[PDB]
């Protein structure tokens, strides 16, 4: 299925994923498509931050769902 | 106003709709009482599959008009 990762800034990136993929996988797909470190990516769906462990399935994130990306300021890790 | 939604099985239910209601809505009124997902629904009227955006009024569906339902197997 396809999802949309939008930023408050306004940018929108579409992704090709599967309801079995792990939030970790995605933060990695975003890096490949936008060259952005996953250790800096916070994903938001239904007002909650997504953990690299769970999967879209757990968060009932269906096809064409919209996700948000907020980058952490630390970077220190 | 009131309309009918029929399956080829013969089953016939009724929905309370407004002439300005979209196909998208009607599908959602079918999920509420039949539990059928809207993305697996295909509604037919006058030998034509109907489109989500158009309204009943657009295809000119009056009261007690009979629409036909057919379901997908995959449903995207």
């Amino acid at each position: 299925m396809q999802i949309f990762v939008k930023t408050l800034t306004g940018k929108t990136i579409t992704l090709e994923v599967e309801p079995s993929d792990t939030i970790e996988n995605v933060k990695a797909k975003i890096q490949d498509k936008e060259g952005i470190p996953p250790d800096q990516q916070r994903l938001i769906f239904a007002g909650k931050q997504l953990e690299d462990g769970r999967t879209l399935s757990d968060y009932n994130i269906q096809k064409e769902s919209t996700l948000h990306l907020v980058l952490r300021l630390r970077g220190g890790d | 106003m009131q309309i009918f939604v029929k399956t080829l099985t013969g089953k016939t239910i009724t929905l309370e709709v407004e002439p300005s209601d979209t196909i998208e809505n009607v599908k959602a009124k079918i999920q509420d009482k039949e539990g059928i997902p809207p993305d697996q629904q295909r509604l037919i009227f006058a030998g034509k599959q109907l489109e989500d955006g158009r309204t009943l009024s657009d295809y000119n569906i009056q009261r007690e008009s009979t629409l036909h339902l057919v379901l997908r197997l995959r449903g995207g």
Binding site: - | L8, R42, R72, L73, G76
Partner: protein, 83 residues
């Protein structure tokens, strides 16, 4: 000459009662036909939908085939470099 025309008319009473009754018999059938004929556009639509659903599954699978032979051929290189 009376019974003649009289009999020639009584052969028209039933004559029209025969066709009217018949005509009525045929209208009741044209109605049963129209009921069944409304099904056709619906059944044809069903065929296409099951057809399109078939293709989607095929395509969907066909790609899962090319991503599984790419995941297996790459695993060939995770063992190679490994040792």
């Amino acid at each position: 000459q009376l019974e003649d025309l009289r009999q020639q008319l009584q052969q028209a009473e039933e004559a029209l009662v025969a066709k009217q009754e018949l005509i009525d018999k045929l209208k009741e059938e044209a109605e049963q036909h129209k009921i069944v004929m409304e099904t056709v556009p619906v059944l044809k639509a069903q065929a296409d939908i099951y057809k399109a659903d078939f293709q989607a599954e095929r395509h969907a699978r066909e790609k899962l085939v090319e991503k599984k032979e790419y995941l297996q051929e790459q695993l060939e290189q995770l063992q190679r470099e490994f040792n």
